[PDB]
Amino acid sequence: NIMMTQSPSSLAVSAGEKVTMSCKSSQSVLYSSNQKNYLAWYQQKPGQSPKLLIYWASTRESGVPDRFTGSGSGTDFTLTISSVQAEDLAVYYCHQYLSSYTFGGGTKLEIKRADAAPTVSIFPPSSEQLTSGGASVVCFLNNFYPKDINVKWKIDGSERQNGVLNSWTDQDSKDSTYSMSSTLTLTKDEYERHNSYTCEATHKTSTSPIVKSFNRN
Amino acid sequence: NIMMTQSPSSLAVSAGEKVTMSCKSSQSVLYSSNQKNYLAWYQQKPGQSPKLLIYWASTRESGVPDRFTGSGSGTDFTLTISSVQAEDLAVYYCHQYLSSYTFGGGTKLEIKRADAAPTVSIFPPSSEQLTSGGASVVCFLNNFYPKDINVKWKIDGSERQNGVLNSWTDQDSKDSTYSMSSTLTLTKDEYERHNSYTCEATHKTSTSPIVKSFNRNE
Amino acid sequence: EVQLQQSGPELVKPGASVKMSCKASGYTFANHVMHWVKQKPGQGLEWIGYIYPYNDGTKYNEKFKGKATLTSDKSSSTAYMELSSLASEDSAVYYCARGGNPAWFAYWGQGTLVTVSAAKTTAPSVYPLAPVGSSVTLGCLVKGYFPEPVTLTWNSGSLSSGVHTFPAVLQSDLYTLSSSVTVTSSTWPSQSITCNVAHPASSTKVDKKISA
Amino acid sequence: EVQLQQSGPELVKPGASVKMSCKASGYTFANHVMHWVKQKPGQGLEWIGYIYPYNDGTKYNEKFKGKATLTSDKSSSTAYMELSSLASEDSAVYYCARGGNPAWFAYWGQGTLVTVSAAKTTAPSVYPLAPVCGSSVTLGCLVKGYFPEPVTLTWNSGSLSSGVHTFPAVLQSDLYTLSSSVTVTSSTWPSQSITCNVAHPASSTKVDKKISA
RNA sequence: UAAAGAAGGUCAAUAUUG
């Protein structure tokens, strides 16, 4: 019954610097009986469930690091991180529990890091998939920064755009770097009708493309 | 927890005409579940307890005349009387019972009526008070209109200003007229030292003053 | 036939306490709630609190928390309110009113006048007021009493029409009241007219016949 | 010590119903409230309701009334959440959260993914990835063509947790495909057994493909 | 009799403290 508003939607800082995020409630969440602010902060890392960080606006739950600190009262509240670690990458929701239970929009925290060149590796089709009649060439690009990256497949020097499946990860919990996987799937017949297979990667850390190829032989 | 405010603290109309009074609440008294206004009107005649007139803003309680009608919703409400009777002289409070129980300031209603001449009567002291040593001369002036009246006591033609006690009533429930009592108190010794005692009243219904006197043993 | 009969008025010394009763009849005493209301002389109304006689639950106004105590007795359909550490501001009329659970006020009692003062009690002195055609007036004087209220009736209530009771007036630290009644010259002196006075504080009652 | 173990994933046909569970332990079951929270893919959190196991008292969100039904079982200290007449908008992850009476959320469950679709289950095909024919070596494991989500992946039963990258599943041709990579030192391969563990609970599939030279 | 809402009481528990 009380609307929460988190601002900004996204934030990026370097590791080891301070951050501040805001939660604004339509009505006041300060109860007059106990003189407490019915506000709580929760963290949600990629692939995990929410975790309680702060309750009563400023009280830190047991087990939580000392980097997180809550502040505010009435309708304006703030969550602060004194020193951001790579693991702090997550979305943080503010929550009121005075009149029913309503959540905020959430705030995403990004970690700024130095440049990092991608490490490329190619893998030919497995004898298992071949006996089944298919051929997939996988191309891994791990631990690079920034996230902007472009991949290109070539068969015998000719660019191919069809039959490609790409997937990207979020910033690592230890390195704050990105990784990408690219897979090109063909039939066993067509796979054996060509000799060369190539991965062409475009990244900011190099003017010329990063190339990784293998030839049937 | 909700403040009520009535606009007309005092208002006067003639007998047989309609009347309208307002009650304004700070917050809304309309409940959304049942769609009802938690407002009530009560009447209090002089010398009696309050009486329920209307509830749910417009619902009329049983036994009350059909002249009273409630109206309004939300925060502005009105109590109306189609034709004012002499008995309608009273104070009317509006009441909210949604968030705690709070009352309004109340509205006093006066009845306008035609002129009426006072009926004066004088009374010598009683043999009981005399045996005790005192003497009180009472002067009743009943059923007159308008209320503006001045009474003065005279002993053998001389005006007396000390030792006088006056009391007034409100408009009658049947006549809508006023009445007044005036008492002059002396000792039996001083009482027996004079012959004539008079209460003289001045009212709009007569150009010359109204006189009423008696003489000790005449 | 819902009827609420409250107890008589009380004169209390400063700092002491007092308890009054509201006897109910004409309905199921337990099913409905009994409110109490205060009315200072010449001022408006004020809610104190209410009680649920079934299980004796109470809900008080914040302003009367430590001042009023509400109890009940289902065997006799009687509500009680007790006031503690009375001051001058507590001098007022106190009503009892029935509602629902909680609903609104629907029935009211006649009220109980409470006077807080250290002044002693003084019973009145009643005097008949007799005259010296077609219409005769008689009066009755209640002089020098304390505190309020006083009860005055004509022929034990048999005479109600044409009666004018005047409000009491304070003077010399005492109250005084008077009442008049007009009848037909054929009804007096043949038919007896009598004045009946009662003063609860002094525990006194007098009947003064109007004689020619 | 307080732990909340939620049931596994579920695939439901449109219009049908489903019932999940949240088994509590590490505290007094009847002394605390159990909330339930919804989270659509790529969206935020939302409250549904809660139960008081002592009297089985309910308190629902106005929008979920008639959609969700909460019950409890003190004998097993397990709370249940039933959803009726499922539709497309009901595909989401559902958490169970403990509080007080009612208080605030303080302990969460792992969640239970729900897929509402008429499509039927399909088990994946796992394939090992090794170099063709420096100081490090990278191996991979391809999980191609399965429905519905999710799928679990663990290298060497979990003993290998450093230097691993699991990529999110991508939908294509009405089937999901996943991949994963792991990097170790040149001395660690092929002198040590590196094997890929894959489990598709919907199809009750469990495969362990070793990476060969 | 049934639905919804409200007041009080008892019971279990939670929160704020002293």
Place this chain on the structure above:
RNA sequence: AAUAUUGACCUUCUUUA
């Protein structure tokens, strides 16, 4: 011990069928 809160049961009131 006090205040406040959620749920259940019970009595009763209120708006409706």
